[PDB]
Amino acid sequence: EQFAVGEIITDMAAAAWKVGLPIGCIYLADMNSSESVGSDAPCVVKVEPSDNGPLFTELKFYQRAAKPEQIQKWIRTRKLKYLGVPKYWGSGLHDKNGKSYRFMIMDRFGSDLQKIYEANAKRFSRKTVLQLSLRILDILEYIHEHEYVHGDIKASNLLLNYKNPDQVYLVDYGLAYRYCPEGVHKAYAADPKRCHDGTIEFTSIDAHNGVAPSRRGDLEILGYCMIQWLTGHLPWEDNLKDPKYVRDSKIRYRENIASLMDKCFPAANAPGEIAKYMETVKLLDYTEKPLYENLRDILLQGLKAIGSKDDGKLDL
Numbered sequence: 001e002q003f004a005v006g007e008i009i010t011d012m013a014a015a016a017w018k019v020g021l022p023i024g025c026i027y028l029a030d031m032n033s034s035e036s037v038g039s040d041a042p043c044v045v046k047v048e049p050s051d052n053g054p055l056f057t058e059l060k061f062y063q064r065a066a067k068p069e070q071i072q073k074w075i076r077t078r079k080l081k082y083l084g085v086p087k088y089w090g091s092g093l094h095d096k097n098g099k100s101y102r103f104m105i106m107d108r109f110g111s112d113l114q115k116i117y118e119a120n121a122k123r124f125s126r127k128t129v130l131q132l133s134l135r136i137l138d139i140l141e142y143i144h145e146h147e148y149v150h151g152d153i154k155a156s157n158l159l160l161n162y163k164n165p166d167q168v169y170l171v172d173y174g175l176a177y178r179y180c181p182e183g184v185h186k187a188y189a190a191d192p193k194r195c196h197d198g199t200i201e202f203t204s205i206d207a208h209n210g211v212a213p214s215r216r217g218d219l220e221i222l223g224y225c226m227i228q229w230l231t232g233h234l235p236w237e238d239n240l241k242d243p244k245y246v247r248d249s250k251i252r253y254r255e256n257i258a259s260l261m262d263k264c265f266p267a268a269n270a271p272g273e274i275a276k277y278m279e280t281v282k283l284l285d286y287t288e289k290p291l292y293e294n295l296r297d298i299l300l301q302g303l304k305a306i307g308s309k310d311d312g313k314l315d316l
C-alpha cells in the first residue's frame with residue numbers, strides 16, 4: 001500500500017491532489033478539496049518504486065510532449081477536434097515505509113479497445129477502423145514530431161475518453177523510444193540500453209531485426225492492427241511462439257502486398273486503402289519522415305468509397 005486512501009499528495013510544482021481507490025498500481029485521483037475522490041474521478045495517479053526504469057521513461061515523455069497547453073496549442077494550430085495523447089498533470093517523489101516511490105498524475109479514461117473489440121466477436125467495421133486509424137495517425141504525427149516513437153500500438157493501449165466515446169487515446173509510453181534526440185536520428189543499428197521487441201504479432205520488421213524502432217515501424221504496426229481489426233486475424237497468428245516465423249511472413253508479405261490482401265480478405269474483396277496504406281509505408285527509409293497527410297488522404301478515399309466522411313464518429 002503506497003498511499004493512505006484519501007490522503008493529500010503534493011507534486012513538485014506544489015499542486016495538491018487527493019488519492020482514491022485503485023482502478024479495475026494505478027489509483028483514482030482528483031484535485032485537493034473537502035470532497036473525497038469518487039468513481040467519476042477525472043485523473044489517475046501511477047506509482048512505482050523510484051528505481052523502476054519504465055515509469056521514468058514514461059514520465060520523461062509526458063513531461064516533454066504531454067504538457068496540457070502544449071497539446072491544446074497543437075490542437076488549435078493543426079485545426080483538430082481533439083488529440084489522443086493523455087495529459088500530464090504533475091509528478092513527484094513519495095517515501096513510505098523506508099522505500100522511495102515515484103508518482104505521476106495523468107488523465108483518466110474509460111474502456112480500452114481490446115475489451116470492446118472482444119465484445120464485438122473480434123471485428124470492428126471498416127468505418128470504425130478508418131476512423132480509429134485517422135486519429136492514431138494524428139497521435140503518431142504528434143509524438144514523432146516531439147522526437148518519440150511508441151513501438152507498441154495495439155487495441156489494449158487504446159483507451160476511450162471517459163466522458164466522450166468517439167475520442168481514442170494512445171497510452172503506455174514506458175518502453176517508448178527517443179528516436180530523434182536534438183534532431184539527430186538514431187542510425188540503423190541496435191540500442192543496448194533498450195531490449196523490448198514490441199508485441200510479437202504486431203511489431204515492425206525493424207524491431208524483429210533487432211534495430212531501434214523508428215517512424216516507419218509505428219506505421220507498419222498500425223497497418224497490422226488495421227488488418228487484425230478488420231478480419232479478426234493475422235496470417236502468422238498460429239505461430240506466435242516462434243519469432244523467426246513471424247519475421248519471415250512479415251518480410252515475405254511486405255514484398256508481395258497483393259498476396260497479403262488475398263491471404264487476409266475474401267477473394268477479390270479487399271479494401272483498397274489498406275493495400276495502398278501498406279504500399280506507401282513500404283517505401284519509407286528508416287530515417288525518413290512520413291507524409292502523414294497523404295496517409296490520411298488514403299484512409300479518406302476509403303471513407304468516400306463506403307459512402308461516408310470524416311465526421312469523427314467511431315461507431316462503437
Ligand SMILES: C#CCN1C(=O)[C@@H](C)N(C)c2nc(Nc3cc(F)c(O)c(F)c3)ncc21
Binds near residue numbers: 087112
Ligand atoms: C477505472 C477505469 C478505467 N481504466 C481502465 O479500465 C484501464 C483500461 N486503464 C489502464 C485506465 N487507465 C487510465 N489512465 C491511464 C493514463 C495514462 F496516461 C497511461 O499511460 C495509462 F497507462 C493509463 N484511466 C482509466 C483506466
Ligand SMILES: [Cl-]
Binds near residue numbers: 097098
Ligand atoms: Cl512514512
